């Protein structure tokens, strides 16, 4: 009977996931490798680990005490609510006995917290009361199982690069450059041969151009070796797989995924909408997705340009001391004359607008919207699927199953990475590295604590990137909000941050956005005819695309020799959101790719388990990011 | 280890669902009860079963041949792709031998199909070629299992009413009235004491008012017994549970769910949006949901008022003969002067606009949007959940898990009902009953084929509802599109239909919308603090609500003694979409309630299975539609 | 072999209990429904939940902070000793930050605690030192399993009434009346036709009589609907089952259990003893149970009449603030002249004496004593049992097995309800509701916090019950112990309490006494010939009973048309103890009945599991409280 078959199919699906090979998780061992001097001993400095939220020394900016970090890990490893509650959080005083846990300055008894914060912004954040202290997010999310999809520890993602490696130097340099090119028009990030390029309507003091940035990444090197230039023999099988080619105007800041290089940087699905329901009142260039009978506006809230945060020591320290600064950024006010709340809201013109998109990005928003656009267009499903082709011939006739599935996959994604972030890699944030660079150039830290970073900064200084960043930060510090801060005239080398709180309160390696992106897009490519050429139009023989205006009032069309595919744009939107974090300065490149590669494994795993529920015995062809496609 | 624990938790969750009591599915036995005369015998007429798509006699309008229906069922029961492909579809010729299967008129060889259709619309539907033949949707969807949630046959929904019963007469009469009140302003559907009521800007010839409609439902009776008036003793335990009170201006067409009666008819979540991100450029009354950084417009496509379909025999017959007429309805063109594509798109003003909303309603659209509004407002989660309250105190801090869960539930919903629709109840559509009424009054059918309907029509004629419907249809037939049809001057009693194809190609009992509604809302009430009073505002002491303008340009505020709750509006939006179908004339009331009651059981079942994955050992309190709340 | 059979019978008994249907636990959802206003938000007030022990605001008397209650639940749900230890207890100060946990005033460092208490009694309780702080009892008792009997979560008891419901209003009104009739003679609680009625020897100022009280319960109504008057149709299947008839002189305060109405209120087993062992020196009217060779005195400690506690705000607040006041009540001193320590100890004359009986009632005391009386009388066992009838004929010949079984059942009882009290219903105590009434009439609470209670108090005021309670309390406050309290001249509406600490430190719904009562009596009815007519005697044709004297020196006989049965008195003693709490004002009526109905299910379950151990293959016939008897 079905009662038996139901219990079995569910039991069989559990055994499938159990029979799948379980890998062993490896890290760069940096955690306990790099050390600093204590009284009659050397201790692990944890400069190359995530330390945001823990007590940071208010003068130095380094991890205040190691015993805090050692307790912090034990709470993750033991998975105990009690152990994690003993870990000190925020500004702290050092213990009188050596090796004991730091004393937390802030508690529940503090209604006014202005005194503890060193930055003017944080001091007057909570309407004058003083900024609140935020804790670590989803610490015990990696220790939760699921009824469908592979387990969190049943899949791993290969180890992250090191400070001494040439690979990282290119990654941090790439992130720095993106911060200086955050106000650039998206039309610049592509080969000028495709169409006429434009400059952002708002004239912003730029310390770096594209042409310069391309030279930096090809020139930057450690021990006379560039990441892009290094031949296969020198690199490991891991590094070989995630190695990129020489940086080009087309492929700069673009993900290594089929169809990313083809067309403009910005995926169509983040711009275009569906044709107006029934009698077409507007075209696809309008930017209204066919959300059934209602619509979805593709315009995003415009963050007031040339406004970066965490540019000086005081601002940076306070954030790394867990100062809650969410929603302190300002946005452009609307124009009464113009319709559709412009400029207050506008089409994604510059990387800033993408950073804002991903700042409050709903988990699957980017990929749900993509599914709606394709459904409204009338895109065919991968022929292998049942109830396709004519209604008359076969007497049978789904969208419902795919729509739920893109959301299903995201959940499984977060739990897989939340283990990798915390339990395995425990990697520092790019902004947290941005600090280390400045600290070395100010000659802070005890003995040879920051000696590991010495090799990194020289390459960044030798390519002349640091010189620009210091000059760029100087102009940002003339702002009244952080001008009062003592370090304003201190030539701060800190990587500029898009959000006042910068990165979230969870480690860098494994990206929440990228893991969800890889899983959600994989599901969409599985169901849809991945190859299907988007019939957006044709103009003067060559096939038509879209990209934003200089003011972002409408979509400027771009004309391509070959048409854009569903796969190419699905891979491109996956890259956009994942790299969208890299633009804000919260993830490295390698965070994008390895999370994405893990993302599809979680997704694939679900489809293989859900395959037993269907008695049709069909096949689904899923195109992979690493070349060929897998039959399910 | 986890590898073992992972396999077990999944195996344990399967046993939980298997240990749950499995009910036995019962129907009204109407299927093979009502009979008609053949040569030297009586055969099952199947007048009280879903027959849409099968061959209907082109002169009579009845089921052409029973052998077609008997084959149709066998394909569902056997669950064989081959058997279901032999069932004849669309216009057909009768066999020369008696008891053999009908010969299908249309095939793949027909490029032009204009000749087979009797209605002018269908004849010139496919740009002059002639309307296409659509098949049955999701026939084998009820025969699919899932990794999470209870099985399709592990849960049932009690049997549907009969033609002879007084309960149905009120339900069909309620649906008829809604068709005549489809152009009514939503401000009318509430007690006038709450605020000033308005009339729809567009002046439509109305054959029925609210005041009249309220009398009809209280007056209408079978064997001198009204559905609302009948005492508990007379009714069964099933009928007792789904019994309603005497119809009131407040509770007319409103679902029996806590908070449905309270406030206006239209739920806030189908009107209001979230406050503009960052610096508030607009208010909640704007109707922009906080879809992360972008937004969702709450305005829906306006279907040109006073336009109904399937009003005459020719139009009705062709649809019941599986004529594909999707997207033949016309919509109002935009005004160049006004912003935000008005009136082309507008706020949901009249039931028509709700019918359009649910015509292309994305599965979870109504309930996802509701989740976003609550999340953007900053609504608290049911306190029982982990990582709540202060960040500092507990050192821990989800929306991601609930956002996926509302989508997860919908999928499981469709497979549960798709069994009930096809495998169990196989109930006719309200539009298909609308035909039966007309046929009896035209004196069609062989012998006492429609004798069962005789008792129904008399009550509808005795309350004077039919008289209005005939008068209402007359005006609709003066339209040029169906004026040429012979039955235009024939006093057609057919229930007017909102969509040209009317109902979908799957039986009435068990509602796709309502089953998904019940499941999706149940999930939202579980996570959110169900009681939480919405702080939409306060005006002159009394708490403030919203409802549309007469032209639907903005939101007119309504002032209530007590504030609106999250539960009340979540129950109300659940009712709106489910009843939204009843307005279009595709579902009865009982379809709304029993699907919804089944919906929460599917939802509850998932949460109980997913409970094993968490080692926190918390509790979730879920408020039920039938009074008290269940602890998970 | 037996070694195998022993392991199997035990394994088989475990599977039996596992195969029994497991219900799903539902509550009135009141917990998170009723809300109060905080700064820019609404929070769950928890006015309708058990909050005794938690911090209560010392001016208002309401729950001081919700975050305390939310922590309190999490400790129960998580079942963690650590989490429950963080919950604040007793008088507390509010936190400076909002949403954080309240600071406990008292700790281990306080030797003198007089300062924290607001009531004179509590201040000078611990011999001048100041009352101690008591904690919650048997919080983790509901999370313990057993080797015999069904599991705690394998059985549930249907949900409790609400403040808005008419059912509760009658229940609270019934409890209030009992407090005013607590000094009444037990001869009054019966139809005067049975025999001559007497008044309590001690003349007590009574604000309410029986005749008045009977009118109150029939008159009291919510929305013009009385609990006893309401027809079946209006009520739910749960309410239908626990619905009572119009209150009568016979059935007033008497449980709905076969034989409760028959005879006097007070069960014989709480008065009579066994005939003196060997040569009868005294009769059964003496009140000496045949405890083997020794005896048990049926006389109870006399609490000095007209002495009630928690009559003013200060006394009430301190108790609800967990002030330990156990054993502060005074008892009547003995008379040197009279034998058998009278009046210090006496026969149960007034409900006060029953409240004292159940104040220190040993778990099974009432039901063990009942078993001894029946055994000493020579009552026959239910014929189905082995080794019955003649010794000569059958060559075989138990009391030992039943004597242990009544004690066995009690243990299983407490663990079943302790889940319902804490984990499920979490219902407030009647005394805690008694406060809410007063608070509303003093116009305390923030905004519409107590609006829910508004409907309740009006009915109590409209029947004129409150007027008496205020007048009754005034006289009690003239006592020197609570006269100094500021609220003495404040017209206090608080329900008078029998014990200085009133109710115990565990929620109201599910009664420890009633659950044990239902289980213990069920076991006794199973073994004994339930029907057996007690041969207490015969006087002037009609059969003889007993009830106390006005001074309580002996037993006054009552003469009945039909004789009393074992079942009737076993059901009556079960009711007496359960309602004995209702007299003290610690349980509602519904607490008595639903606990009792759950009690027999726990008991029945044990007998079914223990059935496998016997190879005789006999049957036991158990008479149920809901009509017919079940064969085991």
Author numbering:
A (entry chain A), B (entry chain A), C (entry chain A): 3 to 399, 405 to 639
Describing publication, verbatim:
Vanadium-dependent haloperoxidases (VHPOs) are biotechnologically valuable and operationally versatile biocatalysts. VHPOs are categorized according to the most electronegative halide they can oxidize, leading to chloroperoxidases (VCPOs), bromoperoxidases (VBPOs), and iodoperoxidases (VIPOs). The general mechanism for VHPO-catalyzed reactions is based on the two-electron oxidation of halides. For elucidating the halogen specificity in VHPOs, we chose the vanadium-dependent haloperoxidase AmVHPO from the cyanobacterium Acaryochloris marina MBIC 1101721.
The hypothesis that this loop is responsible for the halogen specificity is supported by the crystal structure analyses of the AmVHPO mutant R425D, which has no chlorination activity and lacks a structured conformation of residues 400–405. In the R425D mutant, this motif is only partially present (residue 390–400), so no interactions with 7 can occur. These molecular findings agree with the wild-type structure, in which residues 390–404 are also flexible. No co-crystal structure of 7 and the R425D or the wild-type enzyme could be obtained. An isosteric phosphate, obtained from the reservoir solution, replaced the cofactor vanadate in the enzyme crystals.
